Amino acid sequence: VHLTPEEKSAVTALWGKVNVDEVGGEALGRLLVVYPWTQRFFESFGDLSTPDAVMGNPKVKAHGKKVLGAFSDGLAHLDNLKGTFATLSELHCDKLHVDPENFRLLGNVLVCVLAHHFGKEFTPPVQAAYQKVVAGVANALAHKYH
Amino acid sequence: VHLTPEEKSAVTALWGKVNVDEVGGEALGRLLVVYPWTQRFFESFGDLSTPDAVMGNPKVKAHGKKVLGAFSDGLAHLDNLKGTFATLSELHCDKLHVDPENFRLLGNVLVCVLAHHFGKEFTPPVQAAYQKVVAGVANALAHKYH
Amino acid sequence: VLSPADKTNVKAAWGKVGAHAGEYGAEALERMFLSFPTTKTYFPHFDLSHGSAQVKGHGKKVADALTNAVAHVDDMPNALSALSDLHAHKLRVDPVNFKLLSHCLLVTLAAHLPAEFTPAVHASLDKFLASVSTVLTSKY
Amino acid sequence: VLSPADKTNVKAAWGKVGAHAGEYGAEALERMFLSFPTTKTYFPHFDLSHGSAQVKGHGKKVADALTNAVAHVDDMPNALSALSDLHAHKLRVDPVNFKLLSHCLLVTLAAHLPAEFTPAVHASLDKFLASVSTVLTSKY
Ligand code: HEM
Ligand code: HEM
Ligand code: HEM
Ligand code: HEM
Ligand SMILES: O=N[O-]
């Protein structure tokens, strides 16, 4: 995806402020709570019977941290998302068979978490730039389907 | 998109039997009737007040013929859909702003028309191969959004 | 909302399908598994090969549900209550998959009803399957 | 179906929004136009620039509709009837666009309700906006 230098600027300035040990698990937690069919793919994580149970679940935090690591990785490779995400696409597509609509969903949930964490600072232009980004990652993660 | 030689075989054998002056307008007609929000983009075609009015509309047939021409074109360039569809993507994305979900919809309506026209001959494996195809065209037409 | 014209059109096509409805239900399921392989993971204990008894038996259950929905078209949430529970709560069926199975059910009808599958009737059946889909995903 | 817990959660967040609801409605619309430019073509006669009076006035109409929907949560099809007519019949709004505006309405709440936007409440509001979306697209 092509971000303008003003879009690039919006994305990276906010991102340096992100708690990378936390924001991932908050976005995964919320995905599982808001779109509970996604709990299908996480049967082994244990107690998911409640919202608190999800957010407080150590496995949800542990795994969301890796997810956020992968997002950080595409933010460094905006012009090579297809390349960056190949292995993960192979995994979620060929091995896991997660429907790609869910990639767009997790992207949007992350946007919601950023808005929650940053308030006023997550301005409508800043959101627009992050939408191009999570759109680009979803699409690259889904390449093993195209 | 990569079709196996058996998928390729399924697609091209059926396609040589297609009435190219007809099938396009049948698929466009049905898109407008079944998903009537798409009539938004065709205000100038005239009487769309009825199903018969749509299918019998000379402009619907005229334009669907060009649409089918574009599909025939991707069937010849399976390994270069991005290239083949660039100009049309620019048009539907940058100028028309058609949401890309509708590209997937028209693809599926075309599959329905093929099934209607070919019956028994449009077998479940033959459908599977055509789904990879209309998925690949939708995705290439939507590249000016990614 | 399903209109009178739509209720009439869906009742029509149901009638022509007649007793082939379980067979066509099985064929729609195979069309879905071949066309959209992600859907296969919900049936990990089925043999999904062609001619499978388990796919046949399931096809009949799906076609019977849809027939119950046509027969109680004005009261679908109530007629389909137990099945919406099943698919949302227990099976956790992703809502996208309803669109894929609806599309294959339409293809299967088109392939078998040259006369009945006109543009108006295709519209009405699409709306019917989307209404059933809405019910079946209403319970997450 | 919206549960009692969901009805309670949505009523809660509505309450904290208080009289900022028109302003937040305008902000959600701008978030949508910037993030998903395709939606702009439905407003060809609006100035969509920041601070636009026309975007402000529309924001208030949207927030008032949603407030009418909360206030008549058990009777949404009837409360939103005229608006579902409007958006499906006259305006021909593509159903995908309801998802985009719902998402921006959620972002706008999240950006303004640190305390109220917990995971349960986010779930309940998502379900509320999806129910409103279902009503608003029910009439094609
Ligand atoms: C939105 C973008 C997403 C990103 C960036 C992402 C990233 C990742 C990463 C980095 C891993 C761990 C892979 C490893 O250990 O090498 C992973 C595993 C996994 N993801 Fe995702 N993921 C995404 C979406 C999804 C969604 C939406 C689902 C299901 C709803 C899903 C289900 C899984 C599962 C089940 C695993 C564990 C697979 C295994 O290790 O065997 N992911 N993901
Ligand atoms: C599914 C794949 C589609 C293909 C292959 C396709 C192909 C085409 C072609 C070949 C043209 C004529 C361009 C020219 O004259 O050079 C065209 C024009 C157009 N298409 Fe599509 N189309 C698709 C989907 C859609 C959809 C879903 C919509 C709206 C619902 C749409 C709206 C239009 C409009 C409004 C025009 C006329 C634009 C103009 O000439 O100014 N198309 N399309
Ligand atoms: C038109 C929509 C659908 C209808 C009318 C329908 C109907 C049914 C019915 C009647 C059953 C009960 C079978 C029994 O009692 O033994 C069932 C079970 C099931 N459905 Fe669906 N369903 C639909 C859509 C879907 C979709 C989209 C999926 C996922 C791709 C799905 C996956 C299943 C599964 C996994 C079972 C349990 C099967 C088993 O282990 O035997 N259904 N469905
Ligand atoms: C939560 C969903 C929505 C609500 C509650 C809603 C509400 C409304 C209301 C209350 C009006 C009436 C304005 C008036 O009477 O003057 C209206 C008009 C309109 N809506 Fe929506 N709407 C929604 C979604 C959408 C979406 C997704 C679009 C397209 C992107 C859309 C496009 C419009 C347009 C073009 C008008 C006419 C505006 C004009 O010319 O003044 N709406 N909507
Ligand atoms: O817009 N229906 O997913």
mmCIF file of N, CA, C and O in Angstrom, chain C residues 45-103:
data_model
loop_
_atom_site.group_PDB
_atom_site.id
_atom_site.type_symbol
_atom_site.label_atom_id
_atom_site.label_comp_id
_atom_site.label_asym_id
_atom_site.label_seq_id
_atom_site.Cartn_x
_atom_site.Cartn_y
_atom_site.Cartn_z
ATOM 1 N N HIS C 45 -15.142 -34.677 10.919
ATOM 2 C CA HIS C 45 -15.540 -36.100 11.019
ATOM 3 C C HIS C 45 -16.474 -36.608 9.902
ATOM 4 O O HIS C 45 -17.078 -37.693 10.066
ATOM 5 N N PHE C 46 -16.638 -35.833 8.812
ATOM 6 C CA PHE C 46 -17.391 -36.309 7.657
ATOM 7 C C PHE C 46 -16.335 -36.765 6.661
ATOM 8 O O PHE C 46 -15.230 -36.166 6.566
ATOM 9 N N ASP C 47 -16.661 -37.803 5.906
ATOM 10 C CA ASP C 47 -16.019 -38.041 4.618
ATOM 11 C C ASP C 47 -16.737 -37.144 3.620
ATOM 12 O O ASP C 47 -17.956 -37.257 3.485
ATOM 13 N N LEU C 48 -15.998 -36.223 2.983
ATOM 14 C CA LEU C 48 -16.563 -35.198 2.128
ATOM 15 C C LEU C 48 -16.385 -35.598 0.667
ATOM 16 O O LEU C 48 -16.670 -34.808 -0.228
ATOM 17 N N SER C 49 -15.944 -36.842 0.419
ATOM 18 C CA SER C 49 -15.787 -37.322 -0.950
ATOM 19 C C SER C 49 -17.139 -37.422 -1.623
ATOM 20 O O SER C 49 -18.180 -37.518 -0.931
ATOM 21 N N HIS C 50 -17.142 -37.367 -2.953
ATOM 22 C CA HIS C 50 -18.356 -37.561 -3.760
ATOM 23 C C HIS C 50 -19.064 -38.873 -3.438
ATOM 24 O O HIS C 50 -18.400 -39.920 -3.266
ATOM 25 N N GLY C 51 -20.394 -38.818 -3.282
ATOM 26 C CA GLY C 51 -21.208 -40.016 -2.993
ATOM 27 C C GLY C 51 -21.206 -40.354 -1.514
ATOM 28 O O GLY C 51 -21.670 -41.391 -1.073
ATOM 29 N N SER C 52 -20.671 -39.465 -0.711
ATOM 30 C CA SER C 52 -20.622 -39.770 0.692
ATOM 31 C C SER C 52 -21.999 -39.830 1.318
ATOM 32 O O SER C 52 -22.787 -38.872 1.239
ATOM 33 N N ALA C 53 -22.244 -40.925 2.052
ATOM 34 C CA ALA C 53 -23.508 -41.127 2.770
ATOM 35 C C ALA C 53 -23.679 -40.002 3.790
ATOM 36 O O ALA C 53 -24.785 -39.600 4.080
ATOM 37 N N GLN C 54 -22.575 -39.511 4.356
ATOM 38 C CA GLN C 54 -22.747 -38.548 5.415
ATOM 39 C C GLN C 54 -23.134 -37.184 4.828
ATOM 40 O O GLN C 54 -23.911 -36.446 5.440
ATOM 41 N N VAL C 55 -22.552 -36.856 3.677
ATOM 42 C CA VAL C 55 -22.950 -35.633 2.969
ATOM 43 C C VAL C 55 -24.418 -35.745 2.463
ATOM 44 O O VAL C 55 -25.250 -34.801 2.621
ATOM 45 N N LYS C 56 -24.779 -36.905 1.922
ATOM 46 C CA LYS C 56 -26.200 -37.151 1.577
ATOM 47 C C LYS C 56 -27.160 -36.947 2.732
ATOM 48 O O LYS C 56 -28.178 -36.265 2.545
ATOM 49 N N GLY C 57 -26.827 -37.490 3.912
ATOM 50 C CA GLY C 57 -27.743 -37.471 5.006
ATOM 51 C C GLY C 57 -27.842 -36.037 5.492
ATOM 52 O O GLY C 57 -28.936 -35.555 5.877
ATOM 53 N N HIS C 58 -26.706 -35.334 5.493
ATOM 54 C CA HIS C 58 -26.755 -33.926 5.933
ATOM 55 C C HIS C 58 -27.528 -33.005 4.974
ATOM 56 O O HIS C 58 -28.219 -32.099 5.437
ATOM 57 N N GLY C 59 -27.351 -33.218 3.669
ATOM 58 C CA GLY C 59 -28.070 -32.507 2.629
ATOM 59 C C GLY C 59 -29.561 -32.535 2.883
ATOM 60 O O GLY C 59 -30.282 -31.540 2.621
ATOM 61 N N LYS C 60 -30.046 -33.673 3.396
ATOM 62 C CA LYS C 60 -31.462 -33.865 3.579
ATOM 63 C C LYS C 60 -31.881 -33.069 4.783
ATOM 64 O O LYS C 60 -32.958 -32.476 4.820
ATOM 65 N N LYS C 61 -31.009 -33.024 5.772
ATOM 66 C CA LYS C 61 -31.349 -32.231 6.981
ATOM 67 C C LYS C 61 -31.430 -30.736 6.670
ATOM 68 O O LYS C 61 -32.334 -30.061 7.201
ATOM 69 N N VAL C 62 -30.509 -30.241 5.825
ATOM 70 C CA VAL C 62 -30.455 -28.815 5.442
ATOM 71 C C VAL C 62 -31.730 -28.481 4.625
ATOM 72 O O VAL C 62 -32.399 -27.487 4.900
ATOM 73 N N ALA C 63 -32.038 -29.315 3.634
ATOM 74 C CA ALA C 63 -33.203 -29.115 2.754
ATOM 75 C C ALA C 63 -34.472 -29.186 3.583
ATOM 76 O O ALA C 63 -35.337 -28.367 3.364
ATOM 77 N N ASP C 64 -34.568 -30.110 4.549
ATOM 78 C CA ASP C 64 -35.705 -30.116 5.474
ATOM 79 C C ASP C 64 -35.823 -28.857 6.337
ATOM 80 O O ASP C 64 -36.915 -28.458 6.618
ATOM 81 N N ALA C 65 -34.700 -28.320 6.833
ATOM 82 C CA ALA C 65 -34.722 -27.019 7.564
ATOM 83 C C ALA C 65 -35.262 -25.898 6.670
ATOM 84 O O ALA C 65 -36.065 -25.086 7.142
ATOM 85 N N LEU C 66 -34.751 -25.814 5.431
ATOM 86 C CA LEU C 66 -35.155 -24.751 4.524
ATOM 87 C C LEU C 66 -36.637 -24.931 4.226
ATOM 88 O O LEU C 66 -37.334 -23.959 4.108
ATOM 89 N N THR C 67 -37.092 -26.195 4.117
ATOM 90 C CA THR C 67 -38.524 -26.480 3.838
ATOM 91 C C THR C 67 -39.369 -26.058 5.019
ATOM 92 O O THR C 67 -40.380 -25.422 4.833
ATOM 93 N N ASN C 68 -38.912 -26.338 6.233
ATOM 94 C CA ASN C 68 -39.575 -25.794 7.427
ATOM 95 C C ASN C 68 -39.597 -24.278 7.434
ATOM 96 O O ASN C 68 -40.618 -23.657 7.811
ATOM 97 N N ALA C 69 -38.507 -23.643 6.996
ATOM 98 C CA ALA C 69 -38.532 -22.184 6.914
ATOM 99 C C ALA C 69 -39.587 -21.608 5.880
ATOM 100 O O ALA C 69 -40.301 -20.658 6.174
ATOM 101 N N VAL C 70 -39.683 -22.190 4.702
ATOM 102 C CA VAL C 70 -40.695 -21.830 3.656
ATOM 103 C C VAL C 70 -42.094 -22.027 4.256
ATOM 104 O O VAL C 70 -42.979 -21.137 4.150
ATOM 105 N N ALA C 71 -42.296 -23.155 4.928
ATOM 106 C CA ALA C 71 -43.621 -23.499 5.447
ATOM 107 C C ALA C 71 -44.085 -22.573 6.606
ATOM 108 O O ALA C 71 -45.299 -22.537 6.947
ATOM 109 N N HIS C 72 -43.126 -21.876 7.237
ATOM 110 C CA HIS C 72 -43.331 -20.970 8.334
ATOM 111 C C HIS C 72 -42.630 -19.660 8.108
ATOM 112 O O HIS C 72 -42.051 -19.066 9.058
ATOM 113 N N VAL C 73 -42.812 -19.170 6.900
ATOM 114 C CA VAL C 73 -42.102 -18.019 6.343
ATOM 115 C C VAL C 73 -42.349 -16.745 7.144
ATOM 116 O O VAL C 73 -41.459 -15.858 7.230
ATOM 117 N N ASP C 74 -43.529 -16.634 7.739
ATOM 118 C CA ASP C 74 -43.883 -15.445 8.565
ATOM 119 C C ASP C 74 -43.445 -15.535 10.032
ATOM 120 O O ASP C 74 -43.682 -14.616 10.851
ATOM 121 N N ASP C 75 -42.790 -16.642 10.369
ATOM 122 C CA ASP C 75 -42.432 -16.935 11.748
ATOM 123 C C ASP C 75 -41.086 -17.652 11.791
ATOM 124 O O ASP C 75 -40.833 -18.520 12.674
ATOM 125 N N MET C 76 -40.207 -17.252 10.888
ATOM 126 C CA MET C 76 -38.901 -17.901 10.773
ATOM 127 C C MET C 76 -38.052 -17.850 12.008
ATOM 128 O O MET C 76 -37.428 -18.897 12.323
ATOM 129 N N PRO C 77 -37.992 -16.659 12.734
ATOM 130 C CA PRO C 77 -37.152 -16.666 13.934
ATOM 131 C C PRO C 77 -37.542 -17.781 14.899
ATOM 132 O O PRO C 77 -36.671 -18.486 15.415
ATOM 133 N N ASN C 78 -38.846 -17.987 15.084
ATOM 134 C CA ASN C 78 -39.343 -19.016 15.974
ATOM 135 C C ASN C 78 -39.138 -20.437 15.406
ATOM 136 O O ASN C 78 -38.583 -21.305 16.094
ATOM 137 N N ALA C 79 -39.456 -20.649 14.124
ATOM 138 C CA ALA C 79 -39.245 -21.984 13.518
ATOM 139 C C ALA C 79 -37.758 -22.401 13.525
ATOM 140 O O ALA C 79 -37.428 -23.572 13.756
ATOM 141 N N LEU C 80 -36.864 -21.438 13.302
ATOM 142 C CA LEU C 80 -35.429 -21.729 13.228
ATOM 143 C C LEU C 80 -34.635 -21.479 14.525
ATOM 144 O O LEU C 80 -33.390 -21.497 14.519
ATOM 145 N N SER C 81 -35.346 -21.343 15.639
ATOM 146 C CA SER C 81 -34.694 -20.972 16.908
ATOM 147 C C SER C 81 -33.598 -21.926 17.401
ATOM 148 O O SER C 81 -32.485 -21.513 17.771
ATOM 149 N N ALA C 82 -33.969 -23.195 17.431
ATOM 150 C CA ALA C 82 -33.066 -24.262 17.851
ATOM 151 C C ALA C 82 -31.865 -24.341 16.929
ATOM 152 O O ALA C 82 -30.775 -24.534 17.391
ATOM 153 N N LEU C 83 -32.071 -24.182 15.620
ATOM 154 C CA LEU C 83 -30.941 -24.199 14.697
ATOM 155 C C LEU C 83 -30.077 -22.943 14.791
ATOM 156 O O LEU C 83 -28.889 -23.035 14.615
ATOM 157 N N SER C 84 -30.640 -21.776 15.072
ATOM 158 C CA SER C 84 -29.762 -20.588 15.254
ATOM 159 C C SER C 84 -28.838 -20.713 16.502
ATOM 160 O O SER C 84 -27.640 -20.331 16.455
ATOM 161 N N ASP C 85 -29.382 -21.326 17.552
ATOM 162 C CA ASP C 85 -28.647 -21.741 18.779
ATOM 163 C C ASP C 85 -27.509 -22.647 18.498
ATOM 164 O O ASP C 85 -26.363 -22.380 18.859
ATOM 165 N N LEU C 86 -27.838 -23.746 17.849
ATOM 166 C CA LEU C 86 -26.864 -24.667 17.340
ATOM 167 C C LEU C 86 -25.696 -24.026 16.581
ATOM 168 O O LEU C 86 -24.520 -24.247 17.001
ATOM 169 N N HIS C 87 -25.993 -23.254 15.506
ATOM 170 C CA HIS C 87 -24.940 -22.765 14.585
ATOM 171 C C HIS C 87 -24.096 -21.616 15.218
ATOM 172 O O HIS C 87 -22.896 -21.584 15.036
ATOM 173 N N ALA C 88 -24.757 -20.692 15.903
ATOM 174 C CA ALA C 88 -24.024 -19.612 16.636
ATOM 175 C C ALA C 88 -23.324 -20.079 17.927
ATOM 176 O O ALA C 88 -22.105 -19.894 18.091
ATOM 177 N N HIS C 89 -24.067 -20.705 18.839
ATOM 178 C CA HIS C 89 -23.493 -21.054 20.166
ATOM 179 C C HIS C 89 -22.577 -22.242 20.131
ATOM 180 O O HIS C 89 -21.487 -22.169 20.662
ATOM 181 N N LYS C 90 -23.023 -23.374 19.582
ATOM 182 C CA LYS C 90 -22.208 -24.546 19.659
ATOM 183 C C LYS C 90 -21.204 -24.627 18.543
ATOM 184 O O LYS C 90 -20.016 -24.965 18.755
ATOM 185 N N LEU C 91 -21.642 -24.336 17.336
ATOM 186 C CA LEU C 91 -20.775 -24.657 16.233
ATOM 187 C C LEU C 91 -19.896 -23.455 15.920
ATOM 188 O O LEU C 91 -18.895 -23.585 15.234
ATOM 189 N N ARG C 92 -20.335 -22.304 16.364
ATOM 190 C CA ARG C 92 -19.591 -21.068 16.110
ATOM 191 C C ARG C 92 -19.375 -20.869 14.619
ATOM 192 O O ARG C 92 -18.254 -20.641 14.146
ATOM 193 N N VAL C 93 -20.461 -20.987 13.846
ATOM 194 C CA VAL C 93 -20.286 -20.812 12.414
ATOM 195 C C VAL C 93 -20.049 -19.350 12.026
ATOM 196 O O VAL C 93 -20.852 -18.489 12.263
ATOM 197 N N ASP C 94 -18.969 -19.113 11.317
ATOM 198 C CA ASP C 94 -18.604 -17.789 10.885
ATOM 199 C C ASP C 94 -19.741 -17.293 9.953
ATOM 200 O O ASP C 94 -20.118 -18.032 9.036
ATOM 201 N N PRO C 95 -20.287 -16.069 10.167
ATOM 202 C CA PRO C 95 -21.382 -15.550 9.329
ATOM 203 C C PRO C 95 -21.113 -15.490 7.847
ATOM 204 O O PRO C 95 -22.057 -15.638 7.085
ATOM 205 N N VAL C 96 -19.853 -15.303 7.427
ATOM 206 C CA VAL C 96 -19.500 -15.314 6.043
ATOM 207 C C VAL C 96 -19.927 -16.622 5.372
ATOM 208 O O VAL C 96 -20.273 -16.654 4.176
ATOM 209 N N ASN C 97 -19.935 -17.714 6.131
ATOM 210 C CA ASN C 97 -20.179 -19.070 5.511
ATOM 211 C C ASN C 97 -21.604 -19.302 5.082
ATOM 212 O O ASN C 97 -21.853 -20.100 4.156
ATOM 213 N N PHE C 98 -22.508 -18.518 5.695
ATOM 214 C CA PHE C 98 -23.906 -18.536 5.267
ATOM 215 C C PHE C 98 -24.102 -18.021 3.879
ATOM 216 O O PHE C 98 -24.920 -18.578 3.141
ATOM 217 N N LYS C 99 -23.341 -16.974 3.518
ATOM 218 C CA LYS C 99 -23.335 -16.415 2.152
ATOM 219 C C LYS C 99 -22.825 -17.432 1.105
ATOM 220 O O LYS C 99 -23.367 -17.591 0.009
ATOM 221 N N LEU C 100 -21.787 -18.159 1.487
ATOM 222 C CA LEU C 100 -21.189 -19.160 0.602
ATOM 223 C C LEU C 100 -22.180 -20.318 0.388
ATOM 224 O O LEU C 100 -22.383 -20.703 -0.754
ATOM 225 N N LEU C 101 -22.808 -20.835 1.441
ATOM 226 C CA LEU C 101 -23.760 -21.953 1.281
ATOM 227 C C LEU C 101 -25.014 -21.438 0.518
ATOM 228 O O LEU C 101 -25.514 -22.140 -0.360
ATOM 229 N N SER C 102 -25.433 -20.178 0.772
ATOM 230 C CA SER C 102 -26.604 -19.617 0.054
ATOM 231 C C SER C 102 -26.324 -19.564 -1.436
ATOM 232 O O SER C 102 -27.193 -19.892 -2.262
ATOM 233 N N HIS C 103 -25.139 -19.117 -1.797
ATOM 234 C CA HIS C 103 -24.764 -18.991 -3.177
ATOM 235 C C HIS C 103 -24.780 -20.395 -3.860
ATOM 236 O O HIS C 103 -25.219 -20.538 -5.016
#
